[PDB]
Amino acid sequence: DIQMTQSPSSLSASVGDRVTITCRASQDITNYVNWFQQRPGQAPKVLIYGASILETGVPSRFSGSGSGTDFTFTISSLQPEDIATYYCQQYDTLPLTFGGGTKVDIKR
Amino acid sequence: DIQMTQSPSSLSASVGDRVTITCRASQDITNYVNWFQQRPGQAPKVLIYGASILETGVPSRFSGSGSGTDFTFTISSLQPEDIATYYCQQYDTLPLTFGGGTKVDIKR
Amino acid sequence: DIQMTQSPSSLSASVGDRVTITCRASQDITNYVNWFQQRPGQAPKVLIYGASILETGVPSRFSGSGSGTDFTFTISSLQPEDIATYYCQQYDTLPLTFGGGTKVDIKR
Amino acid sequence: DIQMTQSPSSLSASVGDRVTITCRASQDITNYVNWFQQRPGQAPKVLIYGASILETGVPSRFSGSGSGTDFTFTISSLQPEDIATYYCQQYDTLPLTFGGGTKVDIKR
């Protein structure tokens, strides 16, 4: 359908680091991308929608960009609370496919 | 902001057993409900879209029904391999929202 | 002295992915940065010197940039041979300090 | 391209023992030799620079000598914690090059 390739699949970094996650769509999805945060045992939580629109009450350290086939999710300055798996989801054409996830770990 | 309520939050079924999980919408979403299967350590996989339409290559023991606000998801005979967390997601109104998920487990 | 902060400290990706590694220097180092590749049990091998100069016989998929305090190492398209730990080293002021390394793993 | 030859490639010493590793330069590098300690899973750490100058906070059982092309690195009494791979690096001529390293181990 529309394939979302997400990289890296895992990353470990330290607090205050910049974290960049990408998503490449199989075809032009314009800016129909959701970025979700999923803490363990939780349900994916909308961070960014419309590829670059931050959901109300989401720290400004999270940002997204791109259009077309290449999207970027940036965590400006990793904070101890950010441990989780991040996902991109295209909502352009059904089925609304998800990239593979990026497991973010924070080193002591 | 459509809230999606899902139950039960956890289950423990013996393989062979039938499973029904529901999603109640905080409003009329017609039939725009995605049902996902999230395996442990993997990304959410589309099982059903359009509330009842099965995805290509999805086992038929999986069925979806509902229209409006109430939706049901059924696994006809829990397989050893159905163990995962299932989620409903609304695609009516932006931003797309998920229900809390249901953690389906197998007993011994 | 001069502190090189490198992120991420670990990453796992797939073949054909773009990989971006950064190094932030404590102070202006101009373009006095070495990027090394270290396969297990091996000695660090110079990939890039002068921050952006590729060492003779190094695949063009490896590139580097930046000046001042922010340097980037990019692997254009990860290849199965690239499994290793990557390091930045500043050679501006003694002692010639190393960033913390990025362990690159490739998922099947 | 200065080649740096280092020996031995491996050692196995009993704690208390004295250790000498050398680095022969493929040419005259005066005294620009770095000696690094690379612990298992960590980045290279500067022990000696300027061939013989000890780094701030470095144990004195570590000494460096040589000028020209031949350099020696000595650990006066191998500590349980000296287990690592040591490396010499020339900083005379670009690009900076490392010797093959010496994997110092402790016996039982």
Which 3-state string (H, E, C) describes C11-75?
EEECCCCCEEEEEEECCCCCCCEEEEEECCCCCCEEEEECCCEECCCCCCCEEEEEECCEEEEEE
Alpha carbon distance A100, B76 (integer Å): 28
Residue from A23, A3, A19 nearest A11 by CA: A19
- D34–C95 C-beta distance less than 8 A: yes
Cβ pair A35, B86 in contact under 8 A: no
Please tell me which of the candidates A8, A14, A18 has its beta carbon nearest to residue C11: A8
- Exposed/middle/buried for A41, CB within 10 Å: 0-12, 13-18, 19+? exposed
With vertex at residue A75, the alpha carbon angle to CA C33 and CA B84, rounded to the nearest 5 degrees, is 120
Candidates A3, A5, A6, A10: best to mutate against C (most CBs of C within 10 A) is: A10
The beta strand positions in chain D, using DSSP E, are: 4-7, 10-13, 19-25, 33-38, 44-49, 53-54, 62-67, 70-75, 84-90, 97-98, 102-106
- A20–C7 C-beta distance less than 8 A: no
Question: How many alpha carbons lie under 13 Å from residue D102 in its C-beta half-sphere?
Answer: 26
- C46–D96 C-beta distance less than 8 A: yes
The method of structure determination was X-ray
- For C43, name the nearest residue in chain D, comparing CA atoms only: D100
Provide the resolution (angstroms).
Answer: 1.9
Q: How far is CA B72 from the centre of its chain?
A: 8
- D49–C94 C-beta distance less than 8 A: yes
Name subunits touching A (3+ CB pairs < 8 A): B, C
Alpha carbon distance A13, A5 (integer Å): 21
- Indicate the class that CATH gives domain C1-108: mainly beta
Alpha carbon distance A94, C61 (integer Å): 35
Alpha carbon distance A72, A69 (integer Å): 10
Q: Is A14 on the interface with C (CB under 8 A)?
A: yes
Query: Which tokens belong to D56?
Result: 């701030």
Please tell me which of the candidates D91, D94, D97 has its beta carbon nearest to residue C96: D91
Q: Is C17 on the interface with A (CB under 8 A)?
A: yes
Looking at chain D, list the stretches that DSSP marks H as alpha helix, in order from N- to C-terminal side.
none
Q: Do chains A and D touch (3 or more CB pairs under 8 A)?
A: no
- C87–D44 C-beta distance less than 8 A: yes
CA–CA distance from A47 to each of A37, A69, A86, B36, C3 (Å)? 7, 19, 9, 19, 33
Q: How far is CA D4 from the centre of its chain?
A: 11
Looking at chain A, list the stretches that DSSP marks H as alpha helix, in order from N- to C-terminal side.
none
Task: With H, G, I as helix, E, B as strand and everything else as coil, classify residue A16.
Answer: coil
Alpha carbon distance A64, A71 (integer Å): 7
- For C19, name the nearest residue in chain A, comparing CA atoms only: A8
- C17–A12 C-beta distance less than 8 A: no
